Amino acid sequence: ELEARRPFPERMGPKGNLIYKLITTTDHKLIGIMYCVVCFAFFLVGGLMALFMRTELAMPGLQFLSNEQFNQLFTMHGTVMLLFYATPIVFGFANLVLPLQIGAPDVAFPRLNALSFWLFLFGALIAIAGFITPGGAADFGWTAYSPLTDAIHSPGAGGDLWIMGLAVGGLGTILGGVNMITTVVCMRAPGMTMFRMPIFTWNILVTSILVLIAFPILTAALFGLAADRHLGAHIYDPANGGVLLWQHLFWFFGHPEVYIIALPFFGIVSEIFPVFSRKPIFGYTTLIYATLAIAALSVAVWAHHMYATGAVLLPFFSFMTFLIAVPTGIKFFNWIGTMWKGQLTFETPMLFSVGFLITFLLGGLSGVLLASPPLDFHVTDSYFVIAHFHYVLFGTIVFATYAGIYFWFPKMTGRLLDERLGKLHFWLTFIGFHTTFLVQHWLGDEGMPRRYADYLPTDGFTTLNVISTVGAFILGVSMLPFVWNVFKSWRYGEPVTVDDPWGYGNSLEWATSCPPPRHNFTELPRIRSERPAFELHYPHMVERMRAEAHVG
Amino acid sequence: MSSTQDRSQLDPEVDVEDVPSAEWGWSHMPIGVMHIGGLLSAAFLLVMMRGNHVGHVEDWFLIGFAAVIVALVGRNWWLRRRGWIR
Amino acid sequence: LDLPYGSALTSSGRISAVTEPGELSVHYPFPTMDLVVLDDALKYGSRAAKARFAVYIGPLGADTAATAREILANVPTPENAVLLAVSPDQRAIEVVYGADVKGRGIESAAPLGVSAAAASFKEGNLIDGLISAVRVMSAGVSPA
Amino acid sequence: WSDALALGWPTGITPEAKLNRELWIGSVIASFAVGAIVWGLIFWTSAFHRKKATDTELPRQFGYNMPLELTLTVIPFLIISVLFYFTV
Amino acid sequence: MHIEARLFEILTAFFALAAVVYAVLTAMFATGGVEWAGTTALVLTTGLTLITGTFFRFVARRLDTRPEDYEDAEISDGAGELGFFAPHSWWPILISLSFSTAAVGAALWLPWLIAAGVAFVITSVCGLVFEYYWGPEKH
Amino acid sequence: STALTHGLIGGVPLVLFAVLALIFLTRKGPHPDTYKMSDPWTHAPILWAAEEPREVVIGGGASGKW
Amino acid sequence: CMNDIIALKFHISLNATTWIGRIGMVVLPAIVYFVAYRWAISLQRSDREVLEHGVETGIIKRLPHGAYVELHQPLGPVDEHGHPIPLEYAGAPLPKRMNKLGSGGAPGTGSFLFPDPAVEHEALTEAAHASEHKSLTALKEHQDRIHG
Amino acid sequence: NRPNMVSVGTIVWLSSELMFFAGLFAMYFTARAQAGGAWPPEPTELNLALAVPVTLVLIASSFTCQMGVFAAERGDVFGLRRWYVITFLMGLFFVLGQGYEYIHLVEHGTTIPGSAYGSVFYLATGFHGLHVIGGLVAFVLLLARTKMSKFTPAQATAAIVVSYYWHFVDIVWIALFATIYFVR
Ligand code: HEA
Ligand code: HEA
Ligand SMILES: CCCCCCCCCCCCCCCC(=O)O[C@H](COC(=O)CCCCCCC[C@@H](C)CCCCCCCCC)COP(=O)(O)O[C@H]1[C@H](O)[C@H](O)[C@@H](O)[C@@H](O)[C@@H]1O
Ligand SMILES: CCCCCCCCCCCCCC(=O)O[C@H](COC(=O)CCCCCCCCCCC)COP(=O)(O)O
Ligand SMILES: [Ca+2]
Ligand SMILES: [Cu+2]
Ligand SMILES: [Mg+2]
């Protein structure tokens, strides 16, 4: 019964089978693989700017930069990292496993699914191409307060390209959001009821719903601003009450935006915990309600970004902001209960997902303090807030993203990433991050304001800047082993020839091959619970799963 | 067949595993033309630094591009020699 | 029949196997790069001679190493194929080919194809001998 | 001792500043407590609950606990309520 | 499809409550007026969910239980005929390029570029929509 | 000092590296060690064959000894 | 040649355009060569997929055991198992959409706003179909007589 | 026995397009608050004798659209093809009437850079007017496709979704008219 097999799998394709299949494709699996490659390419560009502005922040004198360059530099870092890396990388993970998770062969509209990626890429390019101009790119922050973006102040051409690129990106985002709702609602397998799908799918569905509300109101505001800058349209005049109109319009978008790039990465950790813990996810019904409550609450909390303005109803936005901190603790406790009383092995996915917990807790703790107007009266618009949103944001889209990559690399490629090369990366990242961002709280507390190009020698805060710069260079060098690992192990990696290399996988993507076929499936199991693949592989556990499920 | 398509039969007057239609036209450029071309292009990029310009940003751009070209050529040559590619 | 822990027969007749988190699936006793070197040699040799090449490493020795004739009946298209069987437990070298490579130079190829393997088998080298034998054999079989 | 707990705020020069400093220092303690009692929980299970040498069967497959989930949504609610009161 | 419909009206109820609360609480004891910017957004956020909820309710009451909506259904119940999906197309990238051209035209205020972009967009959309409907050539 | 800062920024990263690279990259992986011919062959039978050309009666043979 | 007009209308340095062109005139051709070569080979490989499997109709089947397949339309004779017999390349274009093969009739004989009597439509459809048969048959007969 | 996914796709998209107009409504209500007396300033004067008939034509367009949809469900390709042409003509009438009102208003001193009221008026009514032209393009694009192949259920689905879009358009206009010409 000997079977003939090759000594080693094929490394690469036969001199051209990708170039034409890159421009005509409608495969969701292919589009996802070409959705992160570009995201990680933009990550480096966004981070190089941070390295520049961190190097020109360690000594009191202006050594090699100017004011204008520094302004453009932090503005473009801020925009590229948020809108050209994170918001997109959300949708990369969607059309990579969601059809596999629901048991569908395809997305609802494939030929529309293709358009979103190209809109993303070209919008991003138009926005970034502001550096070719003799003037430079946008130099007014990602927030874009008015009147500073009026024809009078910031009359350059970089700002115009910024405005007109964000709109083209936002159209792709909306069109991508339209597709996932349809796919979830009307593409499911028989027996896959709404309350039987995994957590990731719920998160993506609610995220899409949130996108549909957040983005159009931003595009409208951008059109309004372009009207002022090109026609002299008297929309955001200070005399006309437009200084606060624009801020309301922007912050109706801004905070739902930061909750667009949070829940999907909650889903990833919620999918990773049960696999490596050899135990079911503790609380399935309640996590859905937590997601729904967090999403619903994050619409009526938008003026907590506007405290120093002294022009908002303070009680309204403080109480609700306190309330949006309740279900997050529920999620934390559910994760802890999931990883409670089970065999844990701590491979790379679990290590990253645990780093996520440790970082995000302090991020959220700092975030709650900002919600009280008395404390934000002293803290706002200083490096304390920068310390805050570089923990709550660095856990979801860095640690959880890497966890997802290490988790789903074999399922998408058929190779295993190295282990001795994936732990050095994690430890470098962790040490570098805590070295560079911990002292920013103190900096903001002593009275160092944000968006300052330089400072005076007799200011007190000099050594903390040196520590931050050292940590930032460690965090910048940390990424070499990861890229090396991906480059090396894509074609010379260890071959996985099973249906699941992680053993106790629960979702339906582990009930197929590595990688899956063109239409994702050659068979389907019988859908009974939220762990179909586990019951496929372990039929002797059904009686032990439905009897031990409840603790009293 | 109930289809409209008409099959064509034709007879006019590197192997087929790499280039499927290898016997229908010119489908091989010898290696060594491309390596020497790359090196010569790098030399030209390097030599254009002699002129009347007074800036130095352009010089660094030229150096970077030449370095990239040389690195690509070197990598290809090394891998071809060592036996990992054909 | 027999299914390991984590394996299950599906509705299509295909199996779904499982491996432990920190474990592999293939676990050959040879380095990866050596496997690559053997594989591409086996691939380009086979393509040139238009005859499938195979390698066997296992206990074929029962009756003067004559079950190789039965192992050759497992490769795809057994008629147009060549085999090389090696027994390290018994120091046995065997070559057997199907009835389509006749008259293409394989008659004059096996005698030195086995010598090439044996020459390197006089050292502690095993994976080197297979590639050497394949290289010396595939360069003497005419495509027709 | 208050220096290492105010994370480097300046001391006030007006009564309102002193009252704000009092509120802030009182809140930092209330946030380190809930951080410690969760870091401890994460550390506890990451050092004791592991795959031991003795390869036993899969552990207890429990996934629901209604009383603990019900008594857990109420405990932070009181904390945020008191914080809201003091904030006001 | 009752779960889908219920998930939307839950959000509708919450959004309506939030909008009504916000509108009144700003009319009384809040400087200025009603804070028209925030009130406007929340009364249309509710409408967003209301439209979808109503549509889903109608669809759910029209059609009966599907294989997806049945707790204990078999795989063999779903066997049949899915529908149509596009295997491949190179038109999306052309649409994106056309829109990019129009956007670059609008950014630098070059009306000729804007006009060219609009023409390109129309042509590309025409190409996309008519792809699987063109008949054979008449000769 | 303009001497300590420049040396420290570019010095610490390269020292933290190559100390974390000595305690991770200097251990044995899951790839099994190479088989020597001085020991009995203990492994399942191996049958390798090419996939070219793509898509019973046997009339030859040879032998050797080592 | 028009680097002074591009530098005015589009906001870019006039000094920068010269260097862009100077560096480009040695770099861009090489990139174009590589991309063109790969693209041509990929278009070749696109033709070998349809001669072997057939035209993808864009329809998914969902078999009883829960398998997803796509229906293919063979361009020639079929095997006893239903898989098409492979065809040879003859340097000629191949169809890739089912609508170009006649998977779609005329909406109906008539004006843009009013239809014609049914009999006319039936007769015209019959004539057109028969004419298509005759043309194809003539070409096939000529091609068969040539290669004897 | 299944939901129409091309129908659900259009409805979900139409929900998001309603939040686009939220911005414009917010701008209008914000600029209205800082009126400083009479909200329509001295130079401007709205003429109800031209905005009413055009609104009535736009309202009547929906009836013809629905008649076309009803004809589409039966298989009448000519019935579908007949109502959509008159719908297109009425939409074109709407656009030309709106343009005429614009020309009249500009000559009397109400412009975009002239005032804040001009700004909000033109922005709100010009973003709406773009959608109507898009709808007309959709009509012509769909009517061209009904001649390419035989009339199948997919064609009916396309007609229905286009009708959905048109209905949304005129419902938005009714709101705009009520909030601009009456609630001044
Ligand atoms: C996902 C979101 C995200 C991520 C990941 C980061 C990542 C980092 N950020 Fe953050 N940042 C923001 C979101 C993010 N940031 C936002 C929203 C602002 C607001 C500012 C504003 O108002 O505009 C901000 C602003 C901000 C500031 C405040 C600046 C100021 O206000 O003056 C600082 C301070 O140091 C900072 C530092 C960093 C550092 C050191 C990293 C490190 O993570 C990154 C280091 C990584 C790299 C450097 C990659 C390495 C690159 C290479 C090794 C070379 C490769 C070369 C090529 C490809 C050509 N960023
Ligand atoms: C990116 C992701 C992200 C996430 C998830 C959040 C989450 C939160 N954010 Fe936001 N925020 C940003 C991104 C994010 N934020 C960004 C980018 C900015 C700056 C934009 C700019 O101005 O440039 C910002 C700014 C910002 C401000 C304005 C600050 C200022 O400008 O001065 C405020 C104020 O209310 C705020 C509050 C919160 C709160 C209360 C949460 C809550 O979601 C977090 C709650 C988490 C926890 C509570 C921890 C877990 C809970 C438990 C373990 C139970 C414990 C119970 C109690 C303590 C009672 N953040
Ligand atoms: C046709 C495509 C060709 C493809 C080939 C690509 C090759 C690109 C090579 C890169 C060119 C580098 C140009 C450098 C040569 C140079 O001189 O550049 C300087 C300023 O560097 C810059 O900006 C660098 C700009 C980089 C441009 C990158 C080009 C990529 C674009 C062109 C690709 C997009 C293609 C178009 C897309 C359209 C189709 C879409 C697909 C200007 O000097 P200057 O201005 O005098 O600076 C003075 C100080 O010195 C002094 O202190 C003082 O401060 C002042 O006196 C100051 O003036
Ligand atoms: C992505 C593609 C976007 C392209 C948009 C094209 C729109 C450009 C139209 C230019 C209008 C100039 C009219 C003007 O200033 O004349 C003024 C009067 O304009 C009007 O009242 C008619 C304007 C038509 C309404 C259209 C609104 C659309 C809003 C678009 C916001 C960007 C006269 O200015 P003046 O007093 O002479 O200084
Ligand atoms: Ca400095
Ligand atoms: Cu906020
Ligand atoms: Mg501020």
Author numbering:
A (entry chain R): 10 to 561
B (entry chain P): 1 to 13, 28 to 100
C (entry chain V): 14 to 157
D (entry chain Q): 27 to 114
E (entry chain T): 1 to 139
F (entry chain U): 2 to 56, 69 to 79
G (entry chain N): 391 to 538
H (entry chain S): 20 to 203
Sentences from the paper on this structure:
Here we resolve the functional dynamics of the 0.7 MDa III2IV2 obligate supercomplex from Mycobacterium smegmatis, a close relative of M. tuberculosis, the causative agent of tuberculosis.
To experimentally validate our findings, we performed cryo-EM experiments, where we refined a glyco-diosgenin (GDN) detergent-solubilised, symmetric SC to an overall resolution of 2.3 Å, and a local resolution of 2.0 Å for the core parts, and another dataset of the same state, to 2.8 Å global resolution (to 2.5 Å at the core), enabling us to independently determine the position of functionally central and previously unresolved water molecules that are key for the proton transfer reactions. The refined structures revealed a symmetric SC, comprising 22 main subunits, including LpqE. We focus here on the higher resolution dataset, which contains more details, while the other dataset shows overall similar results and serves as an independent validation of our model. The data allowed us to assign densities of 614 water molecules (in the 2.3 Å map, and 249 in the 2.8 Å map), many of which are located around key functional regions in Complexes III and IV. The two datasets are consistent with each other, resolving water molecules at the same positions in several sites, but with significantly higher statistical certainty in the 2.3 Å resolution map. Importantly, the higher (2.3 Å) resolution map allowed us to further assign functionally central water molecules near CuB, as well as in the D- and K-channels. In our cryo-EM data, we observe densities for menaquinone only in the Qo1b and Qo2 sites, consistent with previous studies, although their functional roles for catalysis have remained unclear.
